[PDB]
Coordinates of C-alpha atoms and ligand atoms in Angstrom, one line a residue:
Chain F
X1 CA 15.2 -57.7 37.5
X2 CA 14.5 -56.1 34.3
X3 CA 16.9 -56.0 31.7
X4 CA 16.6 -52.1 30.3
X5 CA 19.4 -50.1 30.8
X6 CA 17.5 -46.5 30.4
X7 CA 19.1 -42.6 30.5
X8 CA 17.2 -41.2 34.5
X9 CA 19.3 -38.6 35.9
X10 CA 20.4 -35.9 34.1
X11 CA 22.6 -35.2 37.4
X12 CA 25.4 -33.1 35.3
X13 CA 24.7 -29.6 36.2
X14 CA 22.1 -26.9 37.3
X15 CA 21.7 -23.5 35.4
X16 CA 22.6 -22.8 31.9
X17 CA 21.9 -18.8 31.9
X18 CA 23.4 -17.7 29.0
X19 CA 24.2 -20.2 26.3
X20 CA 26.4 -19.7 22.8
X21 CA 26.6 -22.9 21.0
X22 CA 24.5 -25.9 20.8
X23 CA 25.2 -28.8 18.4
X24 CA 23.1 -31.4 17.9
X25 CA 23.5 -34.2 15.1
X26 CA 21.0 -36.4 13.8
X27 CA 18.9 -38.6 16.4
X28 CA 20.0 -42.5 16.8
X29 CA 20.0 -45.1 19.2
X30 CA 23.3 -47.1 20.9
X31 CA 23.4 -50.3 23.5
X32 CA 23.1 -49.5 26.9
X33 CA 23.0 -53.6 27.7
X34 CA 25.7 -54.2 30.1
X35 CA 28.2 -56.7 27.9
X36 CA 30.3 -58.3 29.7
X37 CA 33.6 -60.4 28.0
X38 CA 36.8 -59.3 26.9
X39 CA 36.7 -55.5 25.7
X40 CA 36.1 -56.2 22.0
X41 CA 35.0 -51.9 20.6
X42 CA 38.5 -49.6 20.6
X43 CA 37.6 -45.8 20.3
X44 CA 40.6 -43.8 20.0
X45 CA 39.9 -40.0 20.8
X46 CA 42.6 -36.7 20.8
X47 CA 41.4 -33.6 21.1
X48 CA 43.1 -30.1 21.0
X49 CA 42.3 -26.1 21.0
Chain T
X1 CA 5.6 -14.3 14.0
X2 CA 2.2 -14.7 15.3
X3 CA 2.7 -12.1 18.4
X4 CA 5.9 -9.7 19.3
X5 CA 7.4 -8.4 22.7
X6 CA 6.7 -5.2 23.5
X7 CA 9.5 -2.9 24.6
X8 CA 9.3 -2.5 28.0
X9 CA 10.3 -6.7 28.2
X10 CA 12.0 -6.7 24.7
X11 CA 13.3 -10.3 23.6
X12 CA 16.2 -11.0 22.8
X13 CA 17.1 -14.4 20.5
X14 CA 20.5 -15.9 19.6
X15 CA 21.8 -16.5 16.0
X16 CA 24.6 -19.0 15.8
X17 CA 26.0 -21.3 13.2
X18 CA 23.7 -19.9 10.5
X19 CA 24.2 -18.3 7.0
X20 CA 22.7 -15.0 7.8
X21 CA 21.4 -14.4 4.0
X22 CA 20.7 -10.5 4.0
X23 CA 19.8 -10.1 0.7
X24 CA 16.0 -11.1 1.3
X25 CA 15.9 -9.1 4.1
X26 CA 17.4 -5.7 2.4
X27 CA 15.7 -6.7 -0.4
X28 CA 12.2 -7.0 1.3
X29 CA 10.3 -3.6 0.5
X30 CA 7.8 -4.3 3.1
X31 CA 10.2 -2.7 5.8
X32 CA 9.4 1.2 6.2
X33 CA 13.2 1.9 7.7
X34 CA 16.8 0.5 7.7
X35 CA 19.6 1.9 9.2
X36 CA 23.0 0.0 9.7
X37 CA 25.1 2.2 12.3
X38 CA 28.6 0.4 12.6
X39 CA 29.2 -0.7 8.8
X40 CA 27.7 -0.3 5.3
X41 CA 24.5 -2.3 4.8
X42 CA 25.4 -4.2 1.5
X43 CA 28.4 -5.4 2.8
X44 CA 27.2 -7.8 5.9
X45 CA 27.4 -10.5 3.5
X46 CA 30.7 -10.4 3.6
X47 CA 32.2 -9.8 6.7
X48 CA 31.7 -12.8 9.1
X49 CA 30.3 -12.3 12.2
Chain N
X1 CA 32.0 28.4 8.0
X2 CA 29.6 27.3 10.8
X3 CA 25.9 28.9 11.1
X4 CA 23.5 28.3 14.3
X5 CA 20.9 26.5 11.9
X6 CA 23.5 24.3 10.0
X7 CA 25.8 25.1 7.5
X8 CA 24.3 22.6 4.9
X9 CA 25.9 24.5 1.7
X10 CA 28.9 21.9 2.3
X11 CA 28.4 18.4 0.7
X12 CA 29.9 15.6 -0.2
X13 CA 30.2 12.4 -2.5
X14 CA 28.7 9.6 -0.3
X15 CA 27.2 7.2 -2.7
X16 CA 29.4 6.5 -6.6
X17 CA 29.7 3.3 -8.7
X18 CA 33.4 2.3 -7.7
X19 CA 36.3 4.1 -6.0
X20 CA 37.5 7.3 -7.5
X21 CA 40.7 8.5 -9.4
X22 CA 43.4 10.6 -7.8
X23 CA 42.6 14.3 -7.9
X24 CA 39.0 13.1 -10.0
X25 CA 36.6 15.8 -9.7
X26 CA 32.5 15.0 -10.3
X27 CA 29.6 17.1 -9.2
X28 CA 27.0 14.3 -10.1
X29 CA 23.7 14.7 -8.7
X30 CA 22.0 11.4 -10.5
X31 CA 20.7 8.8 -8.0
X32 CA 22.5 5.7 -6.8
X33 CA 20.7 3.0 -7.4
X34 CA 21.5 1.2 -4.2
X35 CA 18.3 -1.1 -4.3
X36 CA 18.7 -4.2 -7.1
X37 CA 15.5 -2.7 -8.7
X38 CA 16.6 -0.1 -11.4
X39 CA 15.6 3.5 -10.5
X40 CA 13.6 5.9 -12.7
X41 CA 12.8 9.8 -12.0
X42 CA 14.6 11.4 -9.0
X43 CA 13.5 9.2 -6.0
X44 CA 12.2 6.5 -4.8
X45 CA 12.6 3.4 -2.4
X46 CA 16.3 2.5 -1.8
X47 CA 17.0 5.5 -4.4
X48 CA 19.8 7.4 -2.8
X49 CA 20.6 10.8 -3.4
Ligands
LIG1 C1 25.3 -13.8 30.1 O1 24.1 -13.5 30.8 C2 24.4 -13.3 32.2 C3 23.0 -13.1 32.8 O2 22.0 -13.3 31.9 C4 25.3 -12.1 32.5 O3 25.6 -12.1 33.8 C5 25.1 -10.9 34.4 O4 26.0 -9.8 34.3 C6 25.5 -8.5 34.8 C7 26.6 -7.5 34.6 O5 27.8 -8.1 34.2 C8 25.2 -8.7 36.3 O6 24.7 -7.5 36.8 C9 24.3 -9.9 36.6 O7 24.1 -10.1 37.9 C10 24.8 -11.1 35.9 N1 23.9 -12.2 36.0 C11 24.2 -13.5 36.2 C12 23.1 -14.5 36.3 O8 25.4 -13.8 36.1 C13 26.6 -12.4 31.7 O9 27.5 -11.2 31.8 C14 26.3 -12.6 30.2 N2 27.6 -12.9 29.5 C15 28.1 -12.1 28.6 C16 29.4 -12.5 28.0 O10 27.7 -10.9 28.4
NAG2 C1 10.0 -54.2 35.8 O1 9.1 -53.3 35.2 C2 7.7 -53.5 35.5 C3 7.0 -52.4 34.7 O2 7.7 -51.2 34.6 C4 7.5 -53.3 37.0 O3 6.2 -53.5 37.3 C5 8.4 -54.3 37.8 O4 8.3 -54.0 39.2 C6 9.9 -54.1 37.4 N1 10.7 -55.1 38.0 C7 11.0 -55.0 39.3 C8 11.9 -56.1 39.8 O5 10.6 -54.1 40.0

């Protein structure tokens, strides 16, 4: 009933033994409310090695 | 730092995305030895690592 | 030319201000000054034979 849309499980993996790289950028803060309509925000996204 | 490992359990910390400046460290006299056994000390501030 | 307690009466050039000539010849004994603090008398810390 409570409209808060929270982060609860962190169910993405179990061990990290022996880490290299960490990057973390500066702390903010996006909308987890679930918006409904047409889908207004386009991210476009490539990525290559 | 406050307290050190002791060698039977020696720790062991990561560097990583850093500028490793070397030039207070070789610089600092209040280090009794230094000894660089794969390349020249004066030199790590050039080659990347 | 090898002795049971060290042939030490062989030497060589391991510390000079640049690289060398070709066929340069220099029996120089003065200290390298391989700290960034200017060396006086014979030794010293970071005063390289
Ligand atoms: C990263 O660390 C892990 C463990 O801390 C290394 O994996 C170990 O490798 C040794 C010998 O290769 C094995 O005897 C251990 O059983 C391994 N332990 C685990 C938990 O896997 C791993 O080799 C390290 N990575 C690198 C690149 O050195
Ligand atoms: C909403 O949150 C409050 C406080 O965290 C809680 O008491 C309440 O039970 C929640 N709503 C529902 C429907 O459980």
């Amino acid at each position: 009933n409570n409209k808060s849309w929270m982060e609860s499980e962190f169910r993405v993996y179990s061990s990290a033994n022996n880490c290299t790289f960490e990057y973390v950028s500066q702390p903010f803060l996006m909308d987890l409310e679930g918006k409904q309509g047409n889908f207004k925000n386009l991210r476009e996204f490539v990525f290559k090695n | 730092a406050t307290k050190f490992a002791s060698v039977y359990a020696w720790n062991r910390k990561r560097i990583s995305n850093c500028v490793a400046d070397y030039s207070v460290l070789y610089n600092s006299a209040s280090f009794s030895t230094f000894k660089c056994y794969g390349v020249s000390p004066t030199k790590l501030n050039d080659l990347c690592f | 030319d090898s002795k049971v307690g060290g042939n030490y009466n062989y030497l060589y050039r391991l510390f000079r201000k640049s690289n060398l000539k070709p066929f340069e010849r220099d029996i120089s004994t003065e200290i390298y000054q391989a700290g960034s603090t200017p060396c006086n008398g014979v030794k010293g810390f970071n005063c390289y034979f």
